[PDB]
Amino acid sequence: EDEFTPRPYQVELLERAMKKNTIVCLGTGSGKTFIAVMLIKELAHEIRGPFNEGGKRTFFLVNTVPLVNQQAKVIRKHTSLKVGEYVGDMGVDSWNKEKWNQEFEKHQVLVMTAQIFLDILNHGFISLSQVNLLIFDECHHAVKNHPYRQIMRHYKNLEQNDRPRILGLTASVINSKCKPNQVEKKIKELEATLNSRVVTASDLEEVAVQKYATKPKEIIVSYNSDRKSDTSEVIENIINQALEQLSNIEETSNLNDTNSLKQIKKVLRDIKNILDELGPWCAHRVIKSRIRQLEKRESETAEELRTIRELLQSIFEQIINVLKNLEKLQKNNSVEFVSPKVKKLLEILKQYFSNNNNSSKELCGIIFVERRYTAYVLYKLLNELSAKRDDDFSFIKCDFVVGHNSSPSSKEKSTEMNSKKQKEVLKKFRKGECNLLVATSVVEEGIDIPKCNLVVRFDLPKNFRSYVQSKGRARAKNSKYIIMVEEDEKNKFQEDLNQYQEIEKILLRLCHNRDAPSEEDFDSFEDELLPPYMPYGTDGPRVTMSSAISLLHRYCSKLPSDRFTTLTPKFTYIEQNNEEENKMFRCTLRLPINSPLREPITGQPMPSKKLAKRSAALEACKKLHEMGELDDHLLPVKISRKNAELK
RNA sequence: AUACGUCCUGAUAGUUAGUAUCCAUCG
RNA sequence: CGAUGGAUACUAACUAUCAGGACGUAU
Ligand SMILES: Nc1ncnc2c1ncn2[C@@H]1O[C@H](COP(=O)(O)OP(=O)(O)O)[C@@H](O)[C@H]1O
Ligand SMILES: [Mg+2]
């Protein structure tokens, strides 16, 4: 076992955390996870008690899916306490009370995402008085209507005697771009919501964490996009003519599904965009993928859509015919036809490789792109370049990771991803078999990465926190930070960089010597304009306007009907103005035919339409529970045919 | 010539509504 | 394939500030 040795600032922070509820602000790579580990290990005596006798339990909450495994492995390795792991893949929602009781009895420490915790707490399956300790990972995401805020709202009503301690872990404080003056208001709202005092040790400010923390060097690379191959510009003109023709077709010719031709035009301008950003070959690859999808679709299509698809097929035929003239890949010159920006990226990678060839240290690099499909086509492109056998591309290993949206029905998505495959790719990267990674914002936040030397930003950062975490993604010594900037964008980029640097400076200076939060601010905010539905009182399960729409949609999904069609409530909106002439909104909905209740349900009026939908949802839920379909714990019941006949 | 008040236009900051796109969870 | 959450961009409205134009009053 590792045989860790405590450091003075670690114990200094631990004593303060034990004394009072606090929020930890530390630089990246410092080891706040170990602070949480030690704090958990110190208070392990209470967890030994049985659940039936009131023995409390300690929870851990995290944002995304891979972090669930990441933190759980650390907590299992460094402690003898038993831990449990649950995520939404195994369909934990369809369980009943007894199974949850057994799971709670088995495990002492539980780690899950926020939504599952909220779903469990709302249905009355657990009592907040049984929580020993709760840990907030990435405590800067608790804003507006985030699930963290709803869990806090649940926490507020509990009596102070049995309230558990609250501890916060973060690397960034402000979620978005803020004015230098508004930073105080943002941090005040944060510490008012969490009901804890953010702390900063005098030790971490001086030399202590400075040696352990790392800072990269920043490089600004300018590029121009107006210049492009003359043939490529000819192709863009051709697609402009084609889109004009398609728009004329849409305007002149009636369409049974105008959204279908809109989809044709929009996938077209997507293809034009890929040509602009990447080049003709990648555009043709997307074109052949789309023609494969067209072959899939042509099995079941009507005459008009198939005709316009045939015309667009002729357009791709013309595009490929023109591409045959400039088949530079067949001429073994792949550099020429690609976009200049990709050329600049290739040149930068060549410079890095020429620098590191003498270095015995191996290569490790991360690439950030906004769009999943863009990352996929980029991965294909670098894979092909490596397959080209050329010297500067032979050593390149490329992989991609994106968010997963598993479909129970077929409804196939072109992108390929699986949670098991996700963890396999992650461990493959950790072993070091892959050096270059192209990823979206899934891995951008908080997840530890192996020793990396280079981080390159394909796209510009969007807010302060994204810039901070992307800078902190590099952990090894002598790291590199590179951002590409368009020629006309450099002034705004520089001014935003100055704003970010001054924001970081004032954040560092302001965090020291701040007074404890005021509970008057904690009970000050109130957004719930209506009380929830409490049939059995405080103990029994409740339903809040936030979850009522999801409840109705889930129950409608559970209705016995055809697989092809989905029963969806029809929403009718009524606008009215009172004697005050303010904008009042009121909603009304109708259940499908499978509902025993047929009369439309209406709700109270209020200025916003979303609240009108929520009010109608809550009224419908209360009426449906009154009818008797919903069970004791207010969850939708799969009323089988035998169940319907018996009732 | 100035200040105040009212109206209009333009810009900035905040709030609200709508629209579009993207990402992440829930199924 | 639906919902929720977040981010960005656009539009519209309201509030506040500034600038400019017009009118009334006072100095
Ligand atoms: N006493 C210790 N023994 C072993 N490793 C340590 C010790 N203290 C810090 N570390 C290392 O420091 C790193 C801290 O990173 P992490 O645990 O992800 O949290 P954070 O990113 O908040 O610093 C860990 O990877 C851990 O290996
Ligand atoms: Mg971290």
Quickly list DSSP for A2-18.
------HHHHHHHHHHH
Which numbered atom of ligand 1 lies nearest the CA of A26?
A: 22
Return the closest-CA partner of residue A518 out of A150, A198, A197.
A197
A501 and A621, same domain (yes or no) = no
Sign of the CA dihedral running A289, A290, A291, A295 = positive
Q: What is the SS3 assignment for A437-502?
A: EEECHHHHCCCCCCCCCEEEECCCCCCHHHHHHHHHCCCCCCCEEEEEEEHHHHHHHHHHHHHHHH
Please report the DSSP string for A513-550 in residue order. Answer: S-PPPPHHHHHH----SS--B-SS-SSS--B-HHHHHH
Burial pattern A110-131, b for ≥16 Cβ within 10 A else e, equals bbbbbebbbbbbbbbbbebeeb
Do A263 and A201 share a domain, yes or no?
A: no
- Per-residue tokens: A224: 């121009």
Report residue A428 as tokens: 């493959």
DSSP letter assigned to residue A599: S
How far apart (Å, rounded) are the C-alpha atoms in residues A204 and A9?
7
Q: Work out if A404's Cβ lies within 7 angstroms of strand B.
A: yes
Tell me the three state secondary structure of residue A35.
helix
From CA A283, how far away is CA A274, in angstroms rounded?
Answer: 6
Distance, in Å, from the CA atom of A369 to the CA atom of A588, rounded to the nearest integer, reads: 42
Q: How many domains does chain A have?
A: 4
Q: What is the 3-class SS of A318-344, one letter each residue?
A: HHHHHHHHCCCCCCCCHHHHCCHHHHH
> What's the distance, Cα to Cα, between the start and end of chain A in Å?
60
d(CA A364, CA A395): 12
A465 and A586 part of one domain: no
Residues A263 and A199 in one domain: no
Q: Rounded CA gap, A305 and A603, in Å?
A: 42
> What residue has its CA nearest to the C1' of B18?
A609
Q: Quote the CA–CA distance of A550 and A189 in Å, as a whole number.
A: 29
**Distance from Cα A208 to the centre of ligand 1, integer Å:** 14
Q: How far is CA A210 from CA A26, A203, A205, in A?
A: 11, 10, 8
> How far is CA A130 from its chain centroid?
30
Rounded CA separation A75/A72 (Å): 5
Q: Is the CB of A31 under 6 A from ligand 1?
A: yes
Mutate to test the pocket of ligand 1, among A4, A26, A34 (most ligand atoms within 8 A of CB): A34
Does residue A526 belong to any structural domain of this protein? no
Classify the phi-psi angles of A415: left when phi > 0, otherwise alpha if psi is within -120 to 50, otherwise beta: beta
Q: Give the separation between CA A551 and CA A163, rounded to whole angstroms.
A: 29
Count of other CB atoms within 10 angstroms of residue A332: 9
Q: Nearest-CA neighbor of A437 among A387, A502, A363, A495?
A: A363
The answer to whether the CB of A319 falls within 8 A of the CB of A235 is: yes
User: A301 and A419: one domain?
Assistant: no
A465 and A378 co-located in one domain: yes
The answer to whether residue A478 sits within a structural domain is yes
Looking from the CA of A165 toward its CB, the CA atoms found within 13 Å total: 17
Chain A 172-231, CB < 7 Å to strand B? 179
Indicate whether A221 and A244 sit together in one domain. Answer: no
- Exposure letters A353-390 (e unless 16+ CB within 10 A, then b): eeeeeeeeeebbbbbbbeebebbbbbbbbbbbbbeeee
* Residue that finishes a domain, picked among A283, A302, A325: A325
Strand-strand pairing, A583-590 and A570-577: antiparallel
What's the reported resolution, in angstroms, to a tenth? Answer: 3.3
Protein residue with its CA nearest to atom 21 in ligand 1: A29
Question: Nearest-CA neighbor of A9 among A172, A196, A205?
Answer: A205
Give the closest residue to A43 by CA, choosing from A102, A109, A101.
Answer: A109
Regarding the beta carbon of A28 and ligand 1, being less than 6 Å apart is answered yes
d(CA A515, CA A198): 9
Whether A416 maps to a domain, the answer reads yes
Query: 3-class DSSP state for residue A574?
Result: strand
Q: Which amino acid is at A244?
A: E
Q: Answer yes or no: is A172 within a domain.
A: yes
What 3-state DSSP class applies to A388?
Answer: coil
AA letter at A356 = N
Residue A609 beta carbon within 7 A of nucleic strand B: yes
A372: domain CATH number is 3.40.50.300
Query: Alpha-carbon distance A470 to A481, whole Å?
Result: 9
CA dihedral A104, A110, A112, A117 (to 10 degrees): 50
Measure, in angstroms, how far nucleotide B4 C1' is from residue A16 CA. Answer: 58
**Cβ-count burial of A250 within 10 angstroms (0-12 exposed, 13-18 middle, 19+ buried)?**
middle
Q: Does residue A588 approach strand B to less than 7 Å at its CB? A: no
| Strand arrangement of the beta sheet that strand A398-401 belongs to | A217-223, A480-486, A454-457, A365-368, A436-439, A398-401
| Residues in a beta bridge with A437 | A366, A399
Domain boundary residue, one of A212, A244, A277? A212
Q: Following DSSP, what letter does each residue of A55-77 receive, concatenated?
A: --EEEEEESSSHHHHHHHHHHHH
Q: For residue A552, what are the domain limits?
A: 545-646
Using CA positions, which residue lies closest to atom 3 of ligand 1?
Answer: A4
- Same domain flag for A201 and A125: yes
Look at residue A596 and tell me if it is in a domain.
Answer: yes
Answer yes or no: do A312 and A363 share one domain: no
The CB-based long-range contact list for A138-142 (8 Å cut-off, 24+ gap) reads A138/A62, A138/A63, A138/A169, A138/A170, A138/A445, A138/A446, A139/A23, A139/A168, A139/A169, A139/A170, A139/A190, A139/A194, A140/A170, A140/A172, A140/A173, A140/A174, A140/A175, A140/A190, A140/A465, A141/A63, A141/A175, A142/A190, A142/A193, A142/A194
* Residue A504 · residue A468 · CB < 8 Å: yes
Reported as half-sphere exposure (CB side, CA atoms, 13 A), residue A567 has a value of 17
Residue A350 lies in a domain: yes
Q: Which nucleotide is the nearest neighbour of A408, by CA and C1'?
A: B27
Question: Does A534 fall in a domain?
Answer: no
If asked whether residues A399 and A498 sit together in one domain, one would say yes
Helix (H) or strand (E) holding A561: none
- Which residue, by CA, sits nearest to atom 16 of ligand 1? A31
Report the nucleotide nearest the CA of residue A409, measured to C1'.
C1
Question: Is the CB atom of residue A406 positioned under 7 angstroms from any atom of strand B?
Answer: yes
Examine the domain organization and report whether A172 and A309 are in the same domain.
no
- CA A463 from centre of chain: 15
Any domain includes A51: yes
The percent helix, strand, coil of chain A (3-state, each to 5) is 50, 15, 35
- Nearest to A482, CA basis, from A464, A500, A458, A466: A458
Q: Answer yes or no: do A309 and A351 share one domain.
A: no
The 8 Å CB, 24+ separation contacts for A574-578 are A576/A605
Reduced to 3 states (helix: H, G, I; strand: E, B; else coil), residue A23 is strand
For strand C, the positions having any atom within 7 A of a protein Cβ are 1-8
User: Which of A510, A533, A566 lies at the terminal end of a domain, its last residue?
Assistant: A510
For ligand 1, atom 13, name the residue with the nearest CA: A31
A11 contacts: CB under 8 Å, gap ≥ 6 = none
Contact A549, A617 (CB under 8 A): yes
Residues A301 and A318: their CA atoms lie apart, in Å, by: 24
CB A332 within 8 A of CB A227: no
* Cα A381 from Cα A285, distance rounded (Å): 10
Tokens at A320, concatenated = 């490929």
Taking all atoms of strand C, which protein residues have CB closer than 7 Å?
A: A 143-146, 175-177, 405, 407-409, 411, 462-463, 546, 549-550, 553, 566, 568
